[PDB]
Amino acid sequence: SHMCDAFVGTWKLVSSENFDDYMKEVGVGFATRKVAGMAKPNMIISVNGDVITIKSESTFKNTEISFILGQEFDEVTADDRKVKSTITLDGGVLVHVQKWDGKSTTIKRKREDDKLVVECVMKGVTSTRVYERA
Ligand SMILES: Cc1ccc2c(c1)c(-c1ccccc1)c(-c1ccccc1)n2CCC(=O)O
C-alpha cells in the first residue's frame, strides 16, 4: 500500500523534448509520429489494492494499463506496438520496461516538485515529457 500515493491523480502534458527523435528510434513511422507528436494527453493514475492503473486520454488515442509491480503483462502502446511490459519501483521512481521484436525501451516516471517527469529512453535517445496536475 501507499507505494504510489504521490503519483495518483490526473496529469496534463505541459512540455515535450526530443519526442520525435525518441519515436524514430523506437521505429514509429512518419504519419504516426506527426499525429502522435501533436497530442497533449492527460495521464490518469489510480491504485486499488496492489493494482496500479495508468490511462492516457487524448485526441489521438486513449490507452490503459493495469498491473502489479514486478509482474510482466501485455500492453498495446499508443503507436500500436504489441509489447511485454514490466513496471517496478526503484527508489521511488516507476520504471517501465517494454520488450518487443528483440528491442527494449525504458520509461521512468518520478515526482519532482509539483510535476510528474517522464523520461523515455531508446538506445542513446532520451525524451523528457513533463506533466502537471490537471
Ligand atoms: C509513441 C509513444 C510512446 C510512449 C508514449 C506515448 C506514445 C504516449 C501517448 C501519446 C499520445 C497519446 C496518448 C499516449 C504515452 C503516454 C502518455 C500519457 C499516459 C500514458 C502513456 N507514452 C508514454 C510516455 C509519455 O508520457 O508520453
PDB file of C-alpha atoms and ligand atoms in Angstrom:
ATOM      1  CA  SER A   1       0.000   0.000   0.000  1.00  0.00           C
ATOM      2  CA  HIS A   2       0.756   3.747  -0.372  1.00  0.00           C
ATOM      3  CA  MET A   3       3.643   2.973  -2.811  1.00  0.00           C
ATOM      4  CA  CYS A   4       2.362   5.298  -5.433  1.00  0.00           C
ATOM      5  CA  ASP A   5       0.435   7.953  -3.438  1.00  0.00           C
ATOM      6  CA  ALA A   6       2.237  10.950  -4.877  1.00  0.00           C
ATOM      7  CA  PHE A   7       1.624   9.709  -8.472  1.00  0.00           C
ATOM      8  CA  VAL A   8      -2.136   9.267  -8.092  1.00  0.00           C
ATOM      9  CA  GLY A   9      -4.337  11.781  -9.910  1.00  0.00           C
ATOM     10  CA  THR A  10      -4.925  13.421 -13.244  1.00  0.00           C
ATOM     11  CA  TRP A  11      -1.974  14.979 -15.023  1.00  0.00           C
ATOM     12  CA  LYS A  12      -1.740  17.092 -18.172  1.00  0.00           C
ATOM     13  CA  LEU A  13       1.235  17.165 -20.578  1.00  0.00           C
ATOM     14  CA  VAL A  14       2.870  20.612 -20.435  1.00  0.00           C
ATOM     15  CA  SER A  15       6.180  20.106 -22.227  1.00  0.00           C
ATOM     16  CA  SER A  16       7.879  17.647 -24.503  1.00  0.00           C
ATOM     17  CA  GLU A  17      11.514  17.481 -25.619  1.00  0.00           C
ATOM     18  CA  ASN A  18      13.041  15.209 -28.258  1.00  0.00           C
ATOM     19  CA  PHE A  19       9.915  13.059 -28.551  1.00  0.00           C
ATOM     20  CA  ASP A  20      10.078  12.833 -32.363  1.00  0.00           C
ATOM     21  CA  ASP A  21      13.641  11.504 -32.146  1.00  0.00           C
ATOM     22  CA  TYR A  22      12.589   9.025 -29.445  1.00  0.00           C
ATOM     23  CA  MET A  23       9.749   7.815 -31.641  1.00  0.00           C
ATOM     24  CA  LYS A  24      12.108   7.472 -34.646  1.00  0.00           C
ATOM     25  CA  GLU A  25      14.470   5.359 -32.533  1.00  0.00           C
ATOM     26  CA  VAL A  26      11.548   3.201 -31.427  1.00  0.00           C
ATOM     27  CA  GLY A  27      10.568   2.619 -35.075  1.00  0.00           C
ATOM     28  CA  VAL A  28       7.393   4.744 -35.310  1.00  0.00           C
ATOM     29  CA  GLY A  29       6.518   5.662 -38.896  1.00  0.00           C
ATOM     30  CA  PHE A  30       6.169   9.163 -40.250  1.00  0.00           C
ATOM     31  CA  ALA A  31       2.421   9.679 -40.133  1.00  0.00           C
ATOM     32  CA  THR A  32       2.035   8.241 -36.632  1.00  0.00           C
ATOM     33  CA  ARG A  33       4.932  10.342 -35.394  1.00  0.00           C
ATOM     34  CA  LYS A  34       3.346  13.512 -36.728  1.00  0.00           C
ATOM     35  CA  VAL A  35      -0.118  12.875 -35.266  1.00  0.00           C
ATOM     36  CA  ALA A  36       1.087  11.357 -32.001  1.00  0.00           C
ATOM     37  CA  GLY A  37       3.527  14.212 -31.538  1.00  0.00           C
ATOM     38  CA  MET A  38       0.749  16.831 -31.612  1.00  0.00           C
ATOM     39  CA  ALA A  39      -1.172  15.176 -28.799  1.00  0.00           C
ATOM     40  CA  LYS A  40      -1.353  16.672 -25.329  1.00  0.00           C
ATOM     41  CA  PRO A  41      -2.524  13.623 -23.389  1.00  0.00           C
ATOM     42  CA  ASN A  42      -3.874  13.565 -19.912  1.00  0.00           C
ATOM     43  CA  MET A  43      -2.396  10.809 -17.786  1.00  0.00           C
ATOM     44  CA  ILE A  44      -4.677   9.317 -15.104  1.00  0.00           C
ATOM     45  CA  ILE A  45      -3.046   7.230 -12.405  1.00  0.00           C
ATOM     46  CA  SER A  46      -5.004   5.292  -9.796  1.00  0.00           C
ATOM     47  CA  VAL A  47      -4.436   2.465  -7.325  1.00  0.00           C
ATOM     48  CA  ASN A  48      -6.762  -0.194  -5.927  1.00  0.00           C
ATOM     49  CA  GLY A  49      -5.048  -2.636  -3.594  1.00  0.00           C
ATOM     50  CA  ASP A  50      -1.910  -3.875  -5.356  1.00  0.00           C
ATOM     51  CA  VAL A  51      -3.223  -2.958  -8.801  1.00  0.00           C
ATOM     52  CA  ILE A  52      -1.991   0.274 -10.418  1.00  0.00           C
ATOM     53  CA  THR A  53      -3.803   1.685 -13.434  1.00  0.00           C
ATOM     54  CA  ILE A  54      -2.268   4.227 -15.850  1.00  0.00           C
ATOM     55  CA  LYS A  55      -4.505   5.704 -18.543  1.00  0.00           C
ATOM     56  CA  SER A  56      -3.909   8.177 -21.333  1.00  0.00           C
ATOM     57  CA  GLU A  57      -6.754  10.308 -22.662  1.00  0.00           C
ATOM     58  CA  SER A  58      -6.250  12.291 -25.842  1.00  0.00           C
ATOM     59  CA  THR A  59      -7.234  13.325 -29.262  1.00  0.00           C
ATOM     60  CA  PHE A  60      -5.174  10.719 -30.841  1.00  0.00           C
ATOM     61  CA  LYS A  61      -5.501   7.644 -28.616  1.00  0.00           C
ATOM     62  CA  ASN A  62      -6.761   6.536 -25.284  1.00  0.00           C
ATOM     63  CA  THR A  63      -4.635   3.801 -23.668  1.00  0.00           C
ATOM     64  CA  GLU A  64      -4.967   1.854 -20.413  1.00  0.00           C
ATOM     65  CA  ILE A  65      -2.706  -0.472 -18.486  1.00  0.00           C
ATOM     66  CA  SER A  66      -3.361  -2.175 -15.139  1.00  0.00           C
ATOM     67  CA  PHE A  67      -0.561  -4.048 -13.438  1.00  0.00           C
ATOM     68  CA  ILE A  68       1.073  -5.296 -10.292  1.00  0.00           C
ATOM     69  CA  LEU A  69       4.644  -4.160  -9.607  1.00  0.00           C
ATOM     70  CA  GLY A  70       7.198  -6.683 -10.837  1.00  0.00           C
ATOM     71  CA  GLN A  71       4.676  -8.763 -12.751  1.00  0.00           C
ATOM     72  CA  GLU A  72       5.006  -8.819 -16.545  1.00  0.00           C
ATOM     73  CA  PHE A  73       1.953  -8.080 -18.697  1.00  0.00           C
ATOM     74  CA  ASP A  74       0.857  -7.499 -22.301  1.00  0.00           C
ATOM     75  CA  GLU A  75       0.488  -3.916 -23.478  1.00  0.00           C
ATOM     76  CA  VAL A  76      -0.633  -2.218 -26.728  1.00  0.00           C
ATOM     77  CA  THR A  77       1.134   1.150 -26.984  1.00  0.00           C
ATOM     78  CA  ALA A  78      -0.329   4.346 -28.497  1.00  0.00           C
ATOM     79  CA  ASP A  79       1.689   3.663 -31.704  1.00  0.00           C
ATOM     80  CA  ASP A  80       0.264   0.129 -31.834  1.00  0.00           C
ATOM     81  CA  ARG A  81       3.242  -1.899 -30.732  1.00  0.00           C
ATOM     82  CA  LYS A  82       2.373  -5.171 -29.001  1.00  0.00           C
ATOM     83  CA  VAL A  83       4.896  -5.282 -26.133  1.00  0.00           C
ATOM     84  CA  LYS A  84       5.678  -7.221 -22.980  1.00  0.00           C
ATOM     85  CA  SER A  85       5.934  -4.758 -20.099  1.00  0.00           C
ATOM     86  CA  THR A  86       7.208  -4.910 -16.544  1.00  0.00           C
ATOM     87  CA  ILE A  87       6.875  -1.984 -14.125  1.00  0.00           C
ATOM     88  CA  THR A  88       8.748  -1.714 -10.828  1.00  0.00           C
ATOM     89  CA  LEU A  89       9.570   0.950  -8.233  1.00  0.00           C
ATOM     90  CA  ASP A  90      13.265   1.747  -7.867  1.00  0.00           C
ATOM     91  CA  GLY A  91      13.953   4.276  -5.191  1.00  0.00           C
ATOM     92  CA  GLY A  92      10.573   5.914  -5.622  1.00  0.00           C
ATOM     93  CA  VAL A  93      10.817   6.041  -9.462  1.00  0.00           C
ATOM     94  CA  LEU A  94       8.369   3.948 -11.544  1.00  0.00           C
ATOM     95  CA  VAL A  95      10.482   2.078 -14.076  1.00  0.00           C
ATOM     96  CA  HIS A  96       8.574   0.685 -17.079  1.00  0.00           C
ATOM     97  CA  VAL A  97      10.395  -1.627 -19.470  1.00  0.00           C
ATOM     98  CA  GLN A  98       8.776  -2.630 -22.796  1.00  0.00           C
ATOM     99  CA  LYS A  99      10.128  -5.531 -24.893  1.00  0.00           C
ATOM    100  CA  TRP A 100       9.078  -6.294 -28.483  1.00  0.00           C
ATOM    101  CA  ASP A 101      10.727  -7.677 -31.654  1.00  0.00           C
ATOM    102  CA  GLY A 102      14.062  -8.065 -29.858  1.00  0.00           C
ATOM    103  CA  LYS A 103      14.049  -4.331 -28.893  1.00  0.00           C
ATOM    104  CA  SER A 104      13.649  -2.641 -25.498  1.00  0.00           C
ATOM    105  CA  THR A 105      12.682   0.820 -24.230  1.00  0.00           C
ATOM    106  CA  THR A 106      12.523   2.142 -20.672  1.00  0.00           C
ATOM    107  CA  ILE A 107      10.196   4.837 -19.375  1.00  0.00           C
ATOM    108  CA  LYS A 108      10.886   6.312 -15.938  1.00  0.00           C
ATOM    109  CA  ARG A 109       8.307   8.370 -14.066  1.00  0.00           C
ATOM    110  CA  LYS A 110       9.054  10.465 -10.967  1.00  0.00           C
ATOM    111  CA  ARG A 111       7.618  13.243  -8.909  1.00  0.00           C
ATOM    112  CA  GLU A 112       9.728  16.403  -8.906  1.00  0.00           C
ATOM    113  CA  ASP A 113       8.304  19.457  -7.188  1.00  0.00           C
ATOM    114  CA  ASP A 114       4.701  19.788  -8.447  1.00  0.00           C
ATOM    115  CA  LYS A 115       5.480  17.922 -11.678  1.00  0.00           C
ATOM    116  CA  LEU A 116       5.477  14.359 -12.804  1.00  0.00           C
ATOM    117  CA  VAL A 117       8.572  13.974 -15.053  1.00  0.00           C
ATOM    118  CA  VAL A 118       8.602  11.159 -17.598  1.00  0.00           C
ATOM    119  CA  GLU A 119      11.878  10.131 -19.261  1.00  0.00           C
ATOM    120  CA  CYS A 120      11.698   7.824 -22.255  1.00  0.00           C
ATOM    121  CA  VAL A 121      14.899   6.125 -23.406  1.00  0.00           C
ATOM    122  CA  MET A 122      15.523   4.104 -26.605  1.00  0.00           C
ATOM    123  CA  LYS A 123      19.224   3.240 -27.105  1.00  0.00           C
ATOM    124  CA  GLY A 124      21.076   6.570 -26.887  1.00  0.00           C
ATOM    125  CA  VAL A 125      17.963   8.771 -27.310  1.00  0.00           C
ATOM    126  CA  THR A 126      16.161  10.305 -24.329  1.00  0.00           C
ATOM    127  CA  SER A 127      12.921  12.291 -24.413  1.00  0.00           C
ATOM    128  CA  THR A 128      11.510  14.214 -21.495  1.00  0.00           C
ATOM    129  CA  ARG A 129       7.742  14.635 -21.068  1.00  0.00           C
ATOM    130  CA  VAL A 130       6.644  16.900 -18.203  1.00  0.00           C
ATOM    131  CA  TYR A 131       3.175  16.729 -16.660  1.00  0.00           C
ATOM    132  CA  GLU A 132       1.425  18.964 -14.101  1.00  0.00           C
ATOM    133  CA  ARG A 133      -1.763  18.347 -12.167  1.00  0.00           C
ATOM    134  CA  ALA A 134      -4.830  18.904 -14.271  1.00  0.00           C
TER     135      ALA A 134
HETATM  136  C1  LIG B   1       4.791   6.637 -29.216  1.00  0.00           C
HETATM  137  C2  LIG B   1       4.526   6.789 -27.748  1.00  0.00           C
HETATM  138  C3  LIG B   1       5.493   6.354 -26.785  1.00  0.00           C
HETATM  139  C4  LIG B   1       5.305   6.495 -25.410  1.00  0.00           C
HETATM  140  C5  LIG B   1       4.087   7.091 -25.010  1.00  0.00           C
HETATM  141  C6  LIG B   1       3.119   7.559 -25.939  1.00  0.00           C
HETATM  142  C7  LIG B   1       3.335   7.433 -27.315  1.00  0.00           C
HETATM  143  C8  LIG B   1       2.021   8.075 -25.167  1.00  0.00           C
HETATM  144  C9  LIG B   1       0.816   8.704 -25.717  1.00  0.00           C
HETATM  145  C10 LIG B   1       0.971   9.691 -26.735  1.00  0.00           C
HETATM  146  C11 LIG B   1      -0.156  10.326 -27.303  1.00  0.00           C
HETATM  147  C12 LIG B   1      -1.422   9.988 -26.859  1.00  0.00           C
HETATM  148  C13 LIG B   1      -1.618   9.035 -25.864  1.00  0.00           C
HETATM  149  C14 LIG B   1      -0.498   8.379 -25.284  1.00  0.00           C
HETATM  150  C15 LIG B   1       2.305   7.863 -23.842  1.00  0.00           C
HETATM  151  C16 LIG B   1       1.509   8.117 -22.621  1.00  0.00           C
HETATM  152  C17 LIG B   1       1.030   9.374 -22.255  1.00  0.00           C
HETATM  153  C18 LIG B   1       0.252   9.539 -21.113  1.00  0.00           C
HETATM  154  C19 LIG B   1      -0.106   8.429 -20.324  1.00  0.00           C
HETATM  155  C20 LIG B   1       0.380   7.176 -20.673  1.00  0.00           C
HETATM  156  C21 LIG B   1       1.134   6.975 -21.814  1.00  0.00           C
HETATM  157  N1  LIG B   1       3.579   7.281 -23.729  1.00  0.00           N
HETATM  158  C22 LIG B   1       4.410   7.259 -22.513  1.00  0.00           C
HETATM  159  C23 LIG B   1       5.348   8.471 -22.443  1.00  0.00           C
HETATM  160  C24 LIG B   1       4.622   9.756 -22.371  1.00  0.00           C
HETATM  161  O1  LIG B   1       4.215  10.173 -21.185  1.00  0.00           O
HETATM  162  O2  LIG B   1       4.384  10.441 -23.384  1.00  0.00           O
END
